[PDB]
Amino acid sequence: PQITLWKRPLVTIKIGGQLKEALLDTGADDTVLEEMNLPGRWKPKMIGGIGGFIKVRQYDQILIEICGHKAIGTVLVGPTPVNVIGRNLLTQIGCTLNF
């Protein structure tokens, strides 16, 4: 499909057997999701943006489904203000910018 940018590019994702809303974010190197108690090991990490850095938990080889398109990669979990799907997963669903 094609998504215009008049409004925030919000889509439904499936992760850890749960459905959530997330932003398709070409400005995000990595995927950052709201607090959720995913199973398995993780490693601490700090990511920075406008306003400074926050602490997140890095989970690897996590399966996410975005608009029916499956992807597997690293997901960062922490007190993020919004769920963002970053380039690490957007590439896997064949997402491009076009103008």
**Is 25 known to be catalytic?**
yes
- The Cα–Cα gap between 26 and 3 comes to 13
Please select the residue that binds a copy of itself; options are 17, 19, 51, 61, rule is CB under 8 A.
51
Question: Are 15 and 64 contacting, i.e. CB atoms less than 8 angstroms apart?
Answer: yes
Is the torsion defined by CA of 65, 22, 79, 29 positive or negative?
Answer: positive
Select 27 or 39, whichever has its Cβ closest to a copy of itself.
27
Q: Which residues bind a copy of itself (CB under 8 A)?
A: 1-6, 8-9, 23-29, 32, 47-54, 67, 69, 80-82, 84, 87, 90-91, 93-99
Catalytic residues, which ones?
25
